[PDB]
Amino acid sequence: AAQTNAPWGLARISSTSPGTSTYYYDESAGQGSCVYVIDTGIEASHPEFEGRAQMVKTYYYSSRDGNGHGTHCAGTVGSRTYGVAKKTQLFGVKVLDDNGSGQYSTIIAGMDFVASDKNNRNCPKGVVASLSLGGGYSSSVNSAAARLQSSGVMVAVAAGNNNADARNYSPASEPSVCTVGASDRYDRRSSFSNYGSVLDIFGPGTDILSTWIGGSTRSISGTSMATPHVAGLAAYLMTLGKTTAASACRYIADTANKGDLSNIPFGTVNLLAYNNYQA
């Protein structure tokens, strides 16, 4: 399948070179996989989700995304127009409030929730969790991410937007999960992207168009935007049977475009997520 005039990030993850505008992908499109988006929530009613999104848990008064961040990230995972894995099932877990903030204890609870809840869902091709959040180092938060990964969920987390070494941030700094940095449309490391030896992979993160609340769309930037590209790619590859939850991060790194990125500091991987699609 091919989507013409795709958002640049989708085109980029299906090409060996920057500057293309078509997203090429297998029609299976992540069908049979499930991705939990652990964030401010998801506007499940947005036409772009085609009824494939549901809120399953909230830690606040409502399950509504009053912010937009979670809806944007969910859109990049699996919306019709803006998504990597266009047929995947999306589950929303609201651990962040409508200002986009949340306590570490609530974030941990949300991770433990997903490890259990997945046992109640029909996801024959596997389960992914996308965490576009983080803050200062916490061994407890790292531990929660490690448990979630251990339980059989492919965990993808944002590296952070501090232009610093991600070793000082969580859950970015947990080695066992897939830590995602951001790039721009000219194959540069995004100016805000964290870096360091704990990064596993880069994905598109500057000027990413996706779904927003009120049935709208908008473009925003962050390692929050790169993370769902990798989460969606993982769901896509699991559905094709190329990899499993336990090994997807390594598979993505192995099959990445290598050496394409500029402004990568020594000691950080130069690897950009790539779907290897051939018609």
């Binding site: 937009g68 986009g100 100016s191």
Partner: peptide, 11 residues
């Protein structure tokens, strides 16, 4: 959280 969600950006 300790990270983003603002919406009047930082570059």
């Amino acid at each position: 959280k300790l990270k983003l969600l603002v919406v009047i950006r930082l570059k």
